[PDB]
Design an enzyme around this catalytic site. Structure first.
Site, PDB file in Angstrom:
ATOM      1  N   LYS A   1      13.925  -3.881   0.760  1.00 13.50           N
ATOM      2  CA  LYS A   1      13.741  -4.236  -0.818  1.00 13.50           C
ATOM      3  C   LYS A   1      13.442  -3.580  -1.522  1.00 13.50           C
ATOM      4  O   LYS A   1      12.427  -2.252  -1.487  1.00 13.50           O
ATOM      5  CB  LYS A   1      12.600  -5.194  -0.696  1.00 13.50           C
TER       6      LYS A   1
ATOM      7  N   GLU B   1      10.266  -2.389   2.541  1.00  8.05           N
ATOM      8  CA  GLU B   1       9.684  -2.173   0.172  1.00  8.05           C
ATOM      9  C   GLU B   1       9.478  -0.867   0.579  1.00  8.05           C
ATOM     10  O   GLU B   1       8.561  -0.287   0.112  1.00  8.05           O
ATOM     11  CB  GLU B   1       8.855  -2.780  -0.108  1.00  8.05           C
TER      12      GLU B   1
END
Lengths: 350, 350, 361, 353
Positions: free
Chosen positions: C229, C187
């Site tokens: 992500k 992420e």
């Protein structure tokens, strides 16, 4: 990693010996490698036609100055054309230089080119067939080379790409030179253009030099067989804040101490747009800086050594002596400056 | 960082369109850009004097093969000399190629040069004056270019320096090409030389391609306007372990899936030392590999398209049709192969 | 240039299988790993005391929604505390999640820390003893992990250092996770803060993702056993120029196509400060974008799935059904969105249209 | 290309002053930060129980040696436990050290961890909550820190990943330390294990240090406020070829000259597996090497300073003096060696590299 020696002990000795001769105590470099298109403006300023003969005469004027310049000049950089010209007595210019105790240098880069996707940034070309060219220049009298990379301080420059790419090409150039017994002078010039202050120039200079030496290491460059030609650390040419020569000297020496390995044989400063006097005063302050400097700190000046000589000459053969006199004066001033003996008459803050 | 658009929307469209045309379904590239020296050996194998006329005739023989090759050939890479030669009827070769629906390509590198301090590794030269050359080639009919970098698998190779330097020069070449409307084919060839196995080739291929794409990104390269010419993933020529074409295909496709961004328009495999049939069978297996492939997987073959044709010609003009027939058969075979329709007669393990 | 296999074929299969299950067609991720300091503000907004019981009750409300969410939720990210809590029937939350066909994830980073010498930039910590923690979490039911890095678009950011350091730490985190059978969700969030436009966000996202995957390659990360992500590509929250959902989708998919290798199993978008409806509409547009997309394009939403539910609940145990219904509604919408089959035109509360953006403090 | 000062002038002055005091002419570092598990081996070699009291007594033995060690010891590295222990008189060990003119150091790394996908290579952990730990250690008397990264020379090592990762973590550690007034000692130890020769070690050392300093630059580290703790350049332990101390010194100084910026305040060598005498002879040779050395070249020895003392002690209180005398003798020897004035008696082609 595994070692595959790029150089033999004999090749290293040759390069180190050449590098040391150029920057021996009290000696500096005369950068007279301006191309026809670069010296065009100089000659036109004195109403002199830019012909091969006039260029040859002007170069002869500098190269044949009296012996007072011998202990001041450790090396002379020439442009291709000049390396193959002769003095009035028939002596090739490389012979003239060597006979006065100087080492002959040759410009080998092929100018800058634009880096696409950047805000006017450039890299430098000239690697193609460089090995063969170096082998020939060596046979013809040259022992060191010149290659100029240009970086600019701006809102978004120098960018990561510009720094990485210029550092990489300088390393390639250096590697090729050393394979041919030529000492490469690594020149990552950061232009003084702009209104940035001293601290900004110091910061950028530190980051650029760190990138340069990491690249030199990655390409297996023998530092003892090299010289560094950086910009002095100074405020921008249009900076509103003013500084003293001592401040410029402290900023410059601090930047170098934080990035240049002691193994580098010498640092030969470019003068940029500094006047002849300014260039000498700053170099003197640099050498007087109260910090330990493990490398020779000298000069590689073009205009800073020729400005007054060119003007005194005026393109007239009868002003030969007067013109050479101006050159000698600056050669003597800078020879003293690179030893901290020139007189025109809180490092934690860096 | 801050964006300083290297290309306008119009320039991007031009490059993307050219790239897509070259690798359109069923199409591949005929790599016929051998230099006088690189083609010498092959002409000798057929006892034919290496003269410009025989070279022109041979290239004419390939370029004027009958219309059956039209839907098979999306592009043709030429050597400088050939780009300016004409067929017997007076038509410039570029025109011959275009009339048959092919895009004209031009080799722009200037060969490999040794990297000092490495175990026989190289980088490639050819950047000097490249922009001007690309502009000239563009005006003279070329729409894409070829530049070959070479890496080798050994005990200590490819080294960090070799990977980094070759990836960087490929990016510089790619940037310059795109500034002139030329689609650059990025070719980081890893030689099949050695006794290494399949998994080792896959590993090295993955690391090299990862380095290549990071460099293209750093240099602001427009991927949709580029093509990739990699080696297929295979065991070394001296490897004693045997593999099926399906395993070669799986290793190849897995390596590409792990490193090549979907934006890359197409992959045009080099055949290395593979025979005509072998190159076709492998390309076919690659296209039949169950895994998802977001880019065209086709060919850019030299020897794999010319072997039988050269032999059939034997330097005899009377063998014209016989020679062309061999080339046409391989063009047809590979067109089917790049569609997974060619027939001569446990993925977590990767 | 020599291979020293970080994973065996068996280990690779396990990671790949987990990653694929999480982003199976029509499925997304419920990000309910907010810390006590984060959930506190949420509970406060509804006059609810921030106690362990209230936090437990709230998570139970989401985790025990009716079976309509099963096909919509492929994974649920939990905070350490929640991973060891139990529903009213005594069932550990991981068991609850699993019984509904979901994979259990765990947040393993220890927050952001300042990068000295930068203009307010940070990197993320949490590597110390991570291997042991992953081994334990695996035994306790978790199959994937969460680790958030944060970058900001400004005049001098993200800097070379910020990009390089964040990409490197993500790679270390990913390496340790894969050694313990845990699928790491990478992420690298680029905040929407600022007045920059769509093309600037696209540019930065492309440079950041290129750095991220080069780092993953350097650290020998098995991409098929990972998920990404990222932030969707959108103009800054203060940007004057307006854009359509189609433009946001094109910029997002283009940035991804130019940087994310096909081997990456799936992309689970963070919603940033987008409203529940906006996050669903954009995700839908992304899946409808004409360009070829070799990876699953779904969601990993926190506030974007909980906004209406949190409000409907209001801390009143009596509003249980009401709150869960709002959650189920957003889950169904996003399940359709990650398939490019979402079309609003209906009854979506004003809460689902409210901006969930919060300036970075 | 824009500066955002990580440190103020006052902060820089504090770090620089600390760094210089540690390596002032004639001074070195006593590395006594061995953990319980690490100090277990030492205690067992002398058949002594490994309890907190025995560890305290041993550390006290070294720290309270007579004033002869004062001009020899510029710094002392302690383990967490020891930083909070007291001498018999009740004085905290940090106070004992400072009263003798020494600077107090603290080990802050949390050991090595394996790097997946490598041939047994590692990186080092310990960054989590490091800023808070540093602030606390500073408050409790420490002015510098220790963090050890380990690399190995082998057929395929150190790999590109190992070099890059260890260099990066060392930079992060250095950055956090400097934000808290703690001088970080950067320690990229290249193990002497293997049959490689002197030139291979020199090559690897040069490549590692180049990567280390590029990382420090990228992370905006203030070099004047740092110290370097590298391995001396020596042949592998199993190398068949023999070398003189002069060659070891030339290879070592050459490697440093090619990579360490002159701004680095000092180099404090680790002794690895060298005997006490060998470590002193090599350090002395390094200092006598006929090349320019812009930084102090001293010691940061553990076993090279404690070997004989530990044996003399034997875990018997009655041997206190005999044990302290052994330590004092090595402190004096190395103090002379870091000045190039060492002699066995007592107080009385460079291009081929």
């Amino acid at each position: 990693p595994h070692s595959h020696p790029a150089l033999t002990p004999e090749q290293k000795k040759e390069l180190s010996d050449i590098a040391h001769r150029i920057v021996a105590p009290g000696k500096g470099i005369l950068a007279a490698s301006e191309s026809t298109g670069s010296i065009a403006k100089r000659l036109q300023s004195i109403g002199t036609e830019n012909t091969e003969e006039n260029r040859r005469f002007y170069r002869q004027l500098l190269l044949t100055a009296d012996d007072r310049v011998n202990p001041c000049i450790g090396g002379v950089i020439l442009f291709h054309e000049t390396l193959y010209q002769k003095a009035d007595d028939g002596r090739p210019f490389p012979q003239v230089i060597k006979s006065k105790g100087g080492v002959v240098g040759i410009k080998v880069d092929k100018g800058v080119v634009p880096l696409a996707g950047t805000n006017g940034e450039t890299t430098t070309q000239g690697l193609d067939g460089l090995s063969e060219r170096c082998a020939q220049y060596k046979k013809d009298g040259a022992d060191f080379a010149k290659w100029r990379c240009v970086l600019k301080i701006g809102e978004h420059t120098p960018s990561a790409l510009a720094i990485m790419e210029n550092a990489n090409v300088l390393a390639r150039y250096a590697s090729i030179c050393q394979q041919n017994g030529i000492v490469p002078i690594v020149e990552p010039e950061i232009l003084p253009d702009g209104d940035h202050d001293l601290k900004r120039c110091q910061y950028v200079t530190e980051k650029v030099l760190a990138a340069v030496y990491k690249a030199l290491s990655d390409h297996h460059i023998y530092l003892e067989g090299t010289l560094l030609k950086p910009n002095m650390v100074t405020p921008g040419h249009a900076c509103t804040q003013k500084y003293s020569h001592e401040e410029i000297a402290m900023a410059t020496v601090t930047a170098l101490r934080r990035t240049v390995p002691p193994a580098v044989t010498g640092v030969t400063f470019l003068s940029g747009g500094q006047s002849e006097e300014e260039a000498s005063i700053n170099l003197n302050a640099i050498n007087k800086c109260p910090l330990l400097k493990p490398w020779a700190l000298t000069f590689s000046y073009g205009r800073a050594l020729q400005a007054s000589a060119l003007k005194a000459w005026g393109g007239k053969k009868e002003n030969l002596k007067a013109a050479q006199e101006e050159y000698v004066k600056r050669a003597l001033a800078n020879s003293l400056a690179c030893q901290g003996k020139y007189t025109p008459s809180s490092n934690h803050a860096y």
